[PDB]
Design a protein around this motif. Structure first.
Motif, PDB file in Angstrom:
ATOM      1  N   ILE A  35     -45.743   9.934 -12.595  1.00 27.29           N
ATOM      2  CA  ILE A  35     -45.209  10.140 -13.937  1.00 27.29           C
ATOM      3  C   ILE A  35     -46.026  11.018 -14.867  1.00 27.29           C
ATOM      4  O   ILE A  35     -45.481  11.826 -15.625  1.00 27.29           O
ATOM      5  N   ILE A  36     -47.344  10.865 -14.817  1.00 26.66           N
ATOM      6  CA  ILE A  36     -48.217  11.600 -15.717  1.00 26.66           C
ATOM      7  C   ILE A  36     -48.175  13.104 -15.440  1.00 26.66           C
ATOM      8  O   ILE A  36     -48.006  13.914 -16.355  1.00 26.66           O
ATOM      9  N   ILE A  37     -48.325  13.476 -14.169  1.00 28.12           N
ATOM     10  CA  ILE A  37     -48.224  14.873 -13.767  1.00 28.12           C
ATOM     11  C   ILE A  37     -46.902  15.479 -14.227  1.00 28.12           C
ATOM     12  O   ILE A  37     -46.873  16.557 -14.828  1.00 28.12           O
ATOM     13  N   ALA A  38     -45.804  14.779 -13.961  1.00 30.84           N
ATOM     14  CA  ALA A  38     -44.483  15.261 -14.357  1.00 30.84           C
ATOM     15  C   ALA A  38     -44.406  15.551 -15.848  1.00 30.84           C
ATOM     16  O   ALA A  38     -43.824  16.551 -16.268  1.00 30.84           O
ATOM     17  N   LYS A  39     -44.980  14.669 -16.657  1.00 29.78           N
ATOM     18  CA  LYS A  39     -44.932  14.822 -18.104  1.00 29.78           C
ATOM     19  C   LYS A  39     -45.888  15.900 -18.594  1.00 29.78           C
ATOM     20  O   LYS A  39     -45.568  16.640 -19.514  1.00 29.78           O
ATOM     21  N   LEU A  40     -47.058  15.990 -17.979  1.00 25.38           N
ATOM     22  CA  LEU A  40     -47.983  17.055 -18.318  1.00 25.38           C
ATOM     23  C   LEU A  40     -47.297  18.394 -18.044  1.00 25.38           C
ATOM     24  O   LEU A  40     -47.349  19.304 -18.869  1.00 25.38           O
ATOM     25  N   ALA A  41     -46.638  18.485 -16.893  1.00 24.88           N
ATOM     26  CA  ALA A  41     -45.891  19.682 -16.508  1.00 24.88           C
ATOM     27  C   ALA A  41     -44.754  20.003 -17.475  1.00 24.88           C
ATOM     28  O   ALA A  41     -44.201  21.099 -17.454  1.00 24.88           O
ATOM     29  N   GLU A  42     -44.397  19.037 -18.322  1.00 25.73           N
ATOM     30  CA  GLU A  42     -43.406  19.270 -19.369  1.00 25.73           C
ATOM     31  C   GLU A  42     -44.106  19.560 -20.690  1.00 25.73           C
ATOM     32  O   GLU A  42     -43.489  19.543 -21.747  1.00 25.73           O
ATOM     33  N   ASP A  43     -45.411  19.810 -20.608  1.00 26.32           N
ATOM     34  CA  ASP A  43     -46.229  20.115 -21.776  1.00 26.32           C
ATOM     35  C   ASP A  43     -46.241  18.967 -22.795  1.00 26.32           C
ATOM     36  O   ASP A  43     -46.209  19.200 -24.006  1.00 26.32           O
ATOM     37  N   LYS A  44     -46.285  17.737 -22.295  1.00 28.04           N
ATOM     38  CA  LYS A  44     -46.324  16.576 -23.180  1.00 28.04           C
ATOM     39  C   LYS A  44     -47.729  16.004 -23.290  1.00 28.04           C
ATOM     40  O   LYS A  44     -48.528  16.109 -22.360  1.00 28.04           O
ATOM     41  N   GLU A  45     -48.021  15.409 -24.440  1.00 28.35           N
ATOM     42  CA  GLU A  45     -49.262  14.695 -24.643  1.00 28.35           C
ATOM     43  C   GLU A  45     -49.004  13.215 -24.355  1.00 28.35           C
ATOM     44  O   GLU A  45     -48.027  12.652 -24.853  1.00 28.35           O
ATOM     45  N   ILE A  46     -49.869  12.598 -23.563  1.00 34.05           N
ATOM     46  CA  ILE A  46     -49.588  11.264 -23.048  1.00 34.05           C
ATOM     47  C   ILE A  46     -50.490  10.193 -23.645  1.00 34.05           C
ATOM     48  O   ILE A  46     -51.714  10.347 -23.696  1.00 34.05           O
ATOM     49  N   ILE A  47     -49.854   9.126 -24.128  1.00 34.97           N
ATOM     50  CA  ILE A  47     -50.550   7.936 -24.599  1.00 34.97           C
ATOM     51  C   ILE A  47     -50.230   6.795 -23.649  1.00 34.97           C
ATOM     52  O   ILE A  47     -49.061   6.494 -23.386  1.00 34.97           O
ATOM     53  N   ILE A  48     -51.257   6.142 -23.123  1.00 36.10           N
ATOM     54  CA  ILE A  48     -51.006   4.970 -22.302  1.00 36.10           C
ATOM     55  C   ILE A  48     -51.350   3.734 -23.110  1.00 36.10           C
ATOM     56  O   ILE A  48     -52.458   3.611 -23.644  1.00 36.10           O
ATOM     57  N   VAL A  49     -50.391   2.825 -23.219  1.00 34.87           N
ATOM     58  CA  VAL A  49     -50.618   1.575 -23.898  1.00 34.87           C
ATOM     59  C   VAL A  49     -50.679   0.452 -22.859  1.00 34.87           C
ATOM     60  O   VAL A  49     -49.824   0.367 -21.982  1.00 34.87           O
ATOM     61  N   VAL A  50     -51.690  -0.404 -22.945  1.00 30.48           N
ATOM     62  CA  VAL A  50     -51.835  -1.443 -21.926  1.00 30.48           C
ATOM     63  C   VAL A  50     -51.949  -2.817 -22.550  1.00 30.48           C
ATOM     64  O   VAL A  50     -52.300  -2.961 -23.712  1.00 30.48           O
ATOM     65  N   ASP A  51     -51.605  -3.832 -21.769  1.00 30.41           N
ATOM     66  CA  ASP A  51     -51.530  -5.185 -22.334  1.00 30.41           C
ATOM     67  C   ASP A  51     -52.897  -5.811 -22.606  1.00 30.41           C
ATOM     68  O   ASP A  51     -53.106  -6.425 -23.643  1.00 30.41           O
ATOM     69  N   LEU A  52     -53.821  -5.626 -21.672  1.00 25.50           N
ATOM     70  CA  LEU A  52     -55.007  -6.453 -21.639  1.00 25.50           C
ATOM     71  C   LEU A  52     -56.179  -5.584 -21.224  1.00 25.50           C
ATOM     72  O   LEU A  52     -56.076  -4.823 -20.262  1.00 25.50           O
ATOM     73  N   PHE A  53     -57.280  -5.678 -21.958  1.00 25.70           N
ATOM     74  CA  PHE A  53     -58.521  -5.024 -21.547  1.00 25.70           C
ATOM     75  C   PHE A  53     -59.024  -5.742 -20.305  1.00 25.70           C
ATOM     76  O   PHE A  53     -59.388  -6.924 -20.356  1.00 25.70           O
ATOM     77  N   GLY A  54     -59.034  -5.040 -19.172  1.00 24.61           N
ATOM     78  CA  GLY A  54     -59.372  -5.667 -17.909  1.00 24.61           C
ATOM     79  C   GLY A  54     -58.116  -6.037 -17.139  1.00 24.61           C
ATOM     80  O   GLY A  54     -57.066  -6.314 -17.721  1.00 24.61           O
ATOM     81  N   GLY A  55     -58.205  -6.040 -15.820  1.00 26.13           N
ATOM     82  CA  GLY A  55     -57.029  -6.294 -15.014  1.00 26.13           C
ATOM     83  C   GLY A  55     -56.479  -4.998 -14.453  1.00 26.13           C
ATOM     84  O   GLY A  55     -56.876  -3.910 -14.859  1.00 26.13           O
ATOM     85  N   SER A  56     -55.555  -5.118 -13.520  1.00 27.10           N
ATOM     86  CA  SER A  56     -55.110  -3.976 -12.741  1.00 27.10           C
ATOM     87  C   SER A  56     -54.402  -2.922 -13.581  1.00 27.10           C
ATOM     88  O   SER A  56     -54.624  -1.737 -13.395  1.00 27.10           O
ATOM     89  N   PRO A  57     -53.539  -3.339 -14.522  1.00 26.62           N
ATOM     90  CA  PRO A  57     -52.912  -2.296 -15.342  1.00 26.62           C
ATOM     91  C   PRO A  57     -53.970  -1.474 -16.088  1.00 26.62           C
ATOM     92  O   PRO A  57     -53.876  -0.261 -16.148  1.00 26.62           O
ATOM     93  N   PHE A  58     -54.974  -2.136 -16.636  1.00 27.57           N
ATOM     94  CA  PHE A  58     -56.029  -1.436 -17.356  1.00 27.57           C
ATOM     95  C   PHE A  58     -56.790  -0.502 -16.385  1.00 27.57           C
ATOM     96  O   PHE A  58     -57.090   0.651 -16.717  1.00 27.57           O
ATOM     97  N   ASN A  59     -57.070  -1.013 -15.196  1.00 28.40           N
ATOM     98  CA  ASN A  59     -57.821  -0.240 -14.204  1.00 28.40           C
ATOM     99  C   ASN A  59     -57.055   1.025 -13.819  1.00 28.40           C
ATOM    100  O   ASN A  59     -57.645   2.095 -13.660  1.00 28.40           O
ATOM    101  N   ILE A  60     -55.734   0.907 -13.704  1.00 25.42           N
ATOM    102  CA  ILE A  60     -54.897   2.095 -13.509  1.00 25.42           C
ATOM    103  C   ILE A  60     -54.979   3.083 -14.671  1.00 25.42           C
ATOM    104  O   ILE A  60     -55.146   4.280 -14.453  1.00 25.42           O
ATOM    105  N   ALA A  61     -54.858   2.575 -15.904  1.00 24.56           N
ATOM    106  CA  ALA A  61     -54.944   3.429 -17.069  1.00 24.56           C
ATOM    107  C   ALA A  61     -56.284   4.150 -17.111  1.00 24.56           C
ATOM    108  O   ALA A  61     -56.335   5.351 -17.369  1.00 24.56           O
ATOM    109  N   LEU A  62     -57.366   3.426 -16.836  1.00 23.90           N
ATOM    110  CA  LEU A  62     -58.691   4.034 -16.847  1.00 23.90           C
ATOM    111  C   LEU A  62     -58.779   5.144 -15.812  1.00 23.90           C
ATOM    112  O   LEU A  62     -59.371   6.199 -16.073  1.00 23.90           O
ATOM    113  N   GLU A  63     -58.208   4.908 -14.638  1.00 22.40           N
ATOM    114  CA  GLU A  63     -58.266   5.912 -13.572  1.00 22.40           C
ATOM    115  C   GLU A  63     -57.500   7.173 -13.970  1.00 22.40           C
ATOM    116  O   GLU A  63     -57.891   8.282 -13.594  1.00 22.40           O
TER     117      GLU A  63
END
Lengths: 135, 131, 131, 133, 133, 131
Positions: F53-81
């Protein structure tokens, strides 16, 4: 992409003229939408698609001698049931030192052969002349 | 002198009827085309069609005159757009004496003089008759 | 002021198309009728029909304006013959700005001033555009 | 009427296989050339065995005409092939190598013309003229 | 994993048609690049409209990166073409020799993906390393 | 300013429900996508999903904000990556006042100020009621 400071050439063939005209019109439309001024869109013709590659070089050289160099060129052709042609237009990017946008339709029927397709070539010309510069 | 092509752009069937009328007088024309803007026509669609025609004719090495019904309005706005892009020539307020003179002298004068001629003839052709 | 009736008499479909065009701009008209002279029409047959309309409208206590395409030619000759007999008013060289102004001010001015107004507007509406 | 060819010298190099068809295409090219004002003294016809020899024949023809002091302004290689892809590629490239318009006059058909030849005539005149100064 | 890519800068130039498929191939290339040790600062992604613009876009991309003082060690042009291009494979091939860096053929030529993209990632690292000092 | 795209990455249906809730308040959103990590999801499969998803949106010249539920945990680890690789921006602890303010001011502020704004609004929006 800001195209206000660009000069874009369009060289089109004259066979299948009704379809040719619409593709040119589309390219012209999208060119102007990106800011390319009318004084800066130069349209010239050749008999057929074979003459497009060498016509493009002669067109580019002429524009240099006039003191009004092209920043990109869109060779437009309609061929209905050419492979070599795609090859020279491809190589022409490197020989001419400007973006050459492939505007040649290679169809099997008249029906298959448009304005949107032409616009795509307009958008491409502006981007390729701008993206990798120092603006 | 390049061969000329006349594009008539008007509201509704005005151009279609004007040409019909002229052809009663001087016979069937080649190198004249009419485009009418009807209620329900999208102006941008019509603009692209008109541009379609102009490119085709330029590619035939023709010199293009656009005749329009009314100064102002969508047909005029289309004609102006075409002059901006393609450097065709434009005249407004077309009437019958103008079109007949235009079509019967199209090979005689250059476009600038042609348009001056028919402007004068068009205005002179408008007369209130009192006996 | 009497209610007015406008009769458009032209070659071929010119009048029919001019009215169509005007109606795109100002909506469907009442009190406007068109008569077109086509190749193959007998002028005396058309003259009698036109007279047929004028009498009918006079009998409705209407004031009649005849608008014609071209000074000279059969439509004009018919209009002149109607002015000779019925004292209607006549103007030539009709174009779009004239007809629109005529039909939108038909209740405002008397016929003499109306015709002077549209004569001026018609001539002013013919312009060669340079740029 | 549009392109003046009076000051041009045009070469026609044709193959000899399918000669009846070849001759008609040449005749058409010759006809249209003269209609645009190209003088007879200035239409040079030379032959090669087959279509394969057209590309290199064209170069040798062009070089010969230079050594004679009568340079060609354009060339029309004419061939008839009946059921070549490479050949088209060399003729295409030859435009840039020779520095003159090379008009593709090779028929590539599946079964066994004058108008087609004229087209090639019209093209040669235009390509040699339109972009000059 | 026999190839260390830590000291490499790899460019990825992709088309924008068939974007969903394009994105996945890019993601795969990015993934495998990083697995060999190629750092994020060193993976440069840029786009072109279509596959035709890939060859010349690649040259312009490479020239730009030189002027920035951050030269690419290899490039992966990525395109998706569906028959629902032959020349293109030819220019990308030749581009290896013209640009003097490995150009990995990342163009899908289908009639009707992440792993395929990774393959192109692995190739770029190997070709930039295997034959060096 | 580039157009922004908001990616919500959370455990289970939290992001899907948060967006639903926000849309009751401010209407259907474009440029917001949700990804939920469920029990039984392979984190590396989800990570590759998000990168797509991120690549696709960057390729559309978009600026991306990732919002996550919890500091720590797999969703956060994905966002950090994704921040490590793609330089997107990330905020944790997303709640309703934050998301509503984010989506209604997304065109007003640059991403840095936007995130500072909603951080403040999110914290202020958490209140224990007395009496």
């Amino acid at each position: 992409y800001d195209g206000s400071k660009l000069r874009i050439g369009i060289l089109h063939a004259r066979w299948n003229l009704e379809i040719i005209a619409a593709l040119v019109a589309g390219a012209i439309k999208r060119l102007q939408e990106f800011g390319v001024k009318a004084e800066n869109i130069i349209i010239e013709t050749v008999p057929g698609s074979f003459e497009l590659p060498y016509g493009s070089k002669l067109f580019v050289e002429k524009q240099k001698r006039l003191g009004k160099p092209l920043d990109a060129i869109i060779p437009i052709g309609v061929l209905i049931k050419c492979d070599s042609t795609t090859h020279q237009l491809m190589k022409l990017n490197f020989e001419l030192g400007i973006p050459v946008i492939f505007g040649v339709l290679t169809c099997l029927t008249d029906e298959q052969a448009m304005h949107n397709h032409g616009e795509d070539w307009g958008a491409a010309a502006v981007e390729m002349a701008t993206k990798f510069n120092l603006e | 002198m390049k061969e000329k092509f006349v594009l008539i752009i008007t509201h509704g069937d005005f151009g279609k009827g004007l040409l019909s009328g002229a052809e009663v007088i001087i016979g069937k024309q080649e190198n004249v085309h009419t485009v009418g803007l009807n209620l329900g026509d999208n102006i941008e669609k019509v603009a692209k069609e008109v541009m379609r025609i102009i490119i085709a004719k330029l590619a035939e090495d023709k010199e293009i005159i656009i005749v329009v019904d009314l100064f102002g309005g969508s047909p005029f706005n289309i004609a102006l757009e075409m002059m901006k892009t393609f450097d065709v020539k434009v005249i407004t307020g077309i009437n019958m004496p103008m079109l007949v003179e235009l079509l019967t002298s199209i090979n005689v004068y250059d476009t600038t003089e042609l348009l001056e001629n028919i402007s004068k003839i068009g205005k002179d052709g408008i007369k209130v008759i009192e006996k």
